[PDB]
Ligand binder design. Structure first.
Ligand SMILES: [Cl-]
Ligand SMILES: [Mg+2]
Ligand code: NA
Length: 333
């Protein structure tokens, strides 16, 4: 009966999500999004440990949750995910500094397929330390790619049956944008690039003489030229980026097109951004909403949650580890 907190640590904010399940129905018990100070996390690598710790503490109070066990994930250039084939029934740094986990051929039953995930131990230990500063304990250290898979299964209502489709998921962060293509529920392609919503926010800073503290993108209050000479060129830049990413996937595999394009991240909520992408690609594009078929707790604002929904895809997938191919990069004890 012990559930785990889904905690997504990005470059600009900490996202928490608590899930519960009863009678085959998921339920959002608690959630909160706490902003991180600048340069506290760079490219999903924790730089300022104390800063992340205090943000984790505040996101616990803001979410009003009493849980102390959490699921976190690692990502970046220090994280590897592969699929290796080897004989059945066997008995970045020197392995001594690498955290390794494995999980058990389709064509041939003489050999065996094994999923492999690895990273430097430092990336695990620091995240354990960050949780410790908030009084939290890591039960599962996962990989963001697999977390995206679990949250993707919750999008069957928004799409048919996700187990038969080829869907390109575009997670647009602030500094990083990730294209993940899922075939029949499993990831077959992944490509991260240095591009995100920071390009838009900074443009609003230098042109209208505003500070970094982002607020104008949500509430508004910008002059009438913003829609034409600022937001539109940025949306076109996002379109070109997504278009370029898809062309790389098509040239890498046997696929020439995808069935759907799912947008994730905070930047995915921009008005008609899904339409501009759908216009260019010619493929049905929708904003991710993993809370469509879920019940809701009383202390959770339905409106605020709906706005943050596509940005909570990673945090949602991490929280789904509370209920039973799974990876844990934590050392066995
Ligand atoms: Cl390990
Ligand atoms: Mg995000
Ligand atoms: Na809340």
């Amino acid at each position: 009966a012990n559930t785990l907190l889904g905690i997504d640590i990005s470059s600009t904010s900490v996202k928490l999500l608590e899930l519960s399940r009863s009678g085959g129905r998921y339920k959002v018990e608690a959630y909160a999004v706490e902003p991180l100070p600048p340069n506290a996390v760079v490219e999903k690598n924790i730089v300022e440990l104390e800063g992340v710790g205090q943000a984790l503490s505040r996101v616990l109070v803001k979410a009003k949750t009493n849980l102390k066990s959490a699921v976190v994930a690692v990502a970046g250039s220090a994280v590897i995910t592969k699929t290796i084939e080897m004989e059945a029934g066997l008995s970045p740094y020197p392995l001594e500094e690498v955290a390794i986990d494995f999980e058990v051929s389709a064509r041939n039953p003489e050999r065996v397929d094994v999923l492999l995930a690895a990273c430097r131990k430092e990336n695990v230990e620091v995240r354990e330390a960050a949780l410790a500063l908030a009084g939290l304990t890591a039960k599962v250290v996962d990989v963001e790619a697999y977390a995206l898979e679990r949250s993707y299964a919750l999008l069957s209502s928004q799409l048919a049956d996700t187990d038969q489709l080829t869907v390109a998921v575009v997670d647009i962060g602030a500094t990083m944008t990730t294209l993940s293509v899922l075939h029949n529920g499993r990831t077959i392609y992944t490509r991260e690039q240095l591009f995100g919503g920071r390009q838009l926010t900074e443009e609003i800073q230098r042109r209208y003489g505003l500070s970094v503290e982002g607020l104008a993108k949500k509430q508004g209050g910008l002059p009438d030229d913003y829609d034409s000479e600022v937001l539109r060129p940025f949306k076109d830049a996002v379109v070109q980026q997504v278009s370029r990413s898809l062309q790389f996937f098509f040239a890498a595999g046997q696929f020439n097109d995808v069935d759907y394009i799912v947008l994730a991240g905070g930047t995915a909520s921009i008005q008609d951004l899904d339409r501009l992408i759908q216009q260019k690609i010619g493929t049905p594009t929708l904003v991710a909403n993993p809370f469509a078929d879920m019940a809701l707790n009383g202390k959770v604002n339905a409106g605020a949650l709906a706005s943050d929904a596509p940005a909570l895809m990673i945090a949602c997938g991490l929280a789904l580890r509370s209920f039973d191919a799974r990876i844990n990069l934590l050392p066995w004890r």
